[PDB]
Design a protein around this ligand. Structure first.
Ligand SMILES: CN(C)Cc1cc(/C=N/c2cc(Cl)cc(C(=O)NC(C)(C)CO)c2)ccc1O
Lengths: 39, 156
């Protein structure tokens, strides 16, 4: 059985850590909601 | 129970100890998460209960106690902010310029940040602090990193 806990507020944080890339990917989306890489 | 706006953890005691299966957004008294997190099951908040209202396995989204309320969209230009709620760890804002999923049915934003599956349902935010979608449906790339679709719903 499942329960929820308030883990924080939702705001934009000025000077958050900035990281990751921005890849452009060809994907499919199946009936089960699974994304997969099209190549 | 608790009905306050904000980001929440989704926990279960069905496994060893207290395990975090995912994360969601309380807004306008409605709780928003991803279908895979709850599989549409009821939720406890104190001695308050939350029943499912809307859900779609292909959108991988579910709302509780009312219809889907988040409508804001990625502009396609700006760095967003994810609000990562990782298991056992404090909420942390990570800034990233999204990538794109190109699909045979139009383009959607994508976020290339590594977090464990329990972070599933952690929200993504625009510069006014609006939830433009939810993080934790997506795909593994060559690297072995994670790239989530930015998943968002429709408001009636
Ligand atoms: C319709 N399916 C596809 C929905 C579905 C989704 C998931 C969640 N998948 C995730 C979500 C996150 Cl946020 C992260 C990760 C991950 O692996 N990240 C790493 C950095 C690589 C750590 O290992 C997986 C699970 C089962 C399901 O049915």
């Amino acid at each position: 059985d499942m329960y929820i806990e308030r883990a924080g507020d939702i705001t934009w944080e000025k000077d958050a850590e900035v990281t990751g890339n921005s890849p452009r990917l060809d994907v499919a989306l199946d009936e089960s909601g699974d994304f997969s890489l099209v190549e | 129970g608790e009905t306050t706006d904000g980001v929440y953890r989704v926990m279960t005691r069905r496994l060893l100890g207290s395990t975090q299966v995912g994360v969601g957004v309380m807004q306008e008294g409605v709780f928003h998460t991803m279908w895979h997190v709850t599989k549409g099951a009821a939720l406890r908040s104190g001695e308050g209960r939350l029943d499912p209202y809307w859900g779609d396995v292909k959108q991988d989204l579910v709302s509780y106690c009312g219809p889907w309320k988040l409508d804001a969209a990625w502009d396609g230009l700006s760095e967003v902010q994810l609000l990562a709620v990782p298991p056992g760890e404090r909420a942390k804002n990570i800034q990233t310029l999204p990538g794109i999923f190109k699909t045979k049915d139009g383009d959607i934003g994508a976020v290339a940040l590594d977090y464990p599956a329990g972070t599933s349902g952690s929200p993504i935010l625009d510069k006014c602090g609006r939830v433009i979608g939810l993080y934790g449906n997506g795909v593994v790339i060559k690297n072995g990193s994670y790239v989530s679709a930015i998943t968002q719903g429709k408001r009636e």
